[PDB]
Design a protein around this ligand. Structure first.
Ligand SMILES: C#CCOc1cc(COc2ccc(C(F)(F)F)cc2)ccc1Sc1ccc(OCC(=O)O)c(C)c1C
Ligand SMILES: CCCCCCCO[C@@H]1O[C@H](CO)[C@@H](O)[C@H](O)[C@H]1O
Length: 262
């Protein structure tokens, strides 16, 4: 087992470095000022940032709240695309039935995504694009409800998550575990997913005992954060449904539309 585990963790860590445009290692040095980000904090900085300083269009919007809402959708779509390629490299994810892969992604990407935004976060805002911009929490608290309500819970999750001091090597296995979940609805081969998931959790448990020797309780602490993410994402989807019911001008990217189908 043990040399298997260490090498299974290595391959997952490699898949992660290979597939994600941003790492917490790069985020954390930018945010501390070892590695500059353009500060987005109102209409005119968003315009500046989108005119090439941060991004290189969007469905028409009529106000800054919808506009940011659509910027959030762009990111999520970009993160879903990279999460898919990451997963296509986790051991034997690739060998599940193609529909179970899709089901596992349909139902786990927003949990993974919310774990990973956290890497980009400090109490005051978060890095965006690939570290080229910094959006202030005050600007986002300023948007009108329901938009600002759907954003703030992610900063609350993020800061507490960051208090645990995970690094990219840890997050690669955490994210793998969130995606290989035997209880998503509609899965066909539960036992096999459940089985890959158990190898992943044994790999993480091992990895955390090596990589974080003094944190004696980190492992069940991280199991609980996955449960916090499930609830965080329950809440999120209830707010997206509220926005769909009440803000009828606004639209949803087609991929998000499938993900949300039902
Ligand atoms: C942590 C934290 C704060 O929460 C977020 C932060 C981001 C980072 O991306 C942004 C990029 C640009 C902008 C800007 F500049 F337009 F303000 C804001 C945020 C992106 C998304 C979220 S939360 C989120 C995630 C997904 C999502 O909708 C798409 C979906 O649910 O599938 C929406 C509407 C939201 C609000
Ligand atoms: C890249 C993976 C992203 C996953 C998001 C796509 C999930 O949507 C589902 O895709 C299926 C097509 O296979 C349809 O049969 C379902 O009705 C639909 O809900």
């Amino acid at each position: 087992q043990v040399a298997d585990l260490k090498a299974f963790s290595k391959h997952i860590y490699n898949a992660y470095l290979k597939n994600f445009n941003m790492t917490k290692k790069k985020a954390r040095s930018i945010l501390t000022g070892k590695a500059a980000p353009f500060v987005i904090h109102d209409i005119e900085t968003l315009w500046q940032a989108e005119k090439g300083l941060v991004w290189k269009g969007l469905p028409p919007y009529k106000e800054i709240s919808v506009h940011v809402f659509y910027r959030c959708q762009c990111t999520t779509v970009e993160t879903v695309r990279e999460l898919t390629e990451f997963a296509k490299s986790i051991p034997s994810f690739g060998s599940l039935f193609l529909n179970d892969q899709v089901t596992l992604l349909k139902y786990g990407v927003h949990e993974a995504i919310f774990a990973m935004l956290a890497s980009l976060v400090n109490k005051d805002g978060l890095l965006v694009a690939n570290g080229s911009g910094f959006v202030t929490r005050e600007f986002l608290r300023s948007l009108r409800k329901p938009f600002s309500d759907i954003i703030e819970p992610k900063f609350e999750f993020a800061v507490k998550f960051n208090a645990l001091e995970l690094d990219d090597s840890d997050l690669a296995l955490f994210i793998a575990a969130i995606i290989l979940c035997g209880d998503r609805p509609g899965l066909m081969n539960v036992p096999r997913v459940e089985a890959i998931q158990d190898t992943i959790l044994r790999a993480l448990e091992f990895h955390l005992q090596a990589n974080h020797p003094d944190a004696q309780y980190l492992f069940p602490k991280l199991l609980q954060k996955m449960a916090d993410l499930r609830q965080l994402v329950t809440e999120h989807a209830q707010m997206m449904q509220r926005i769909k019911k009440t803000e009828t001008e606004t639209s949803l990217h087609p991929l998000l539309q499938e993900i949300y189908k039902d």
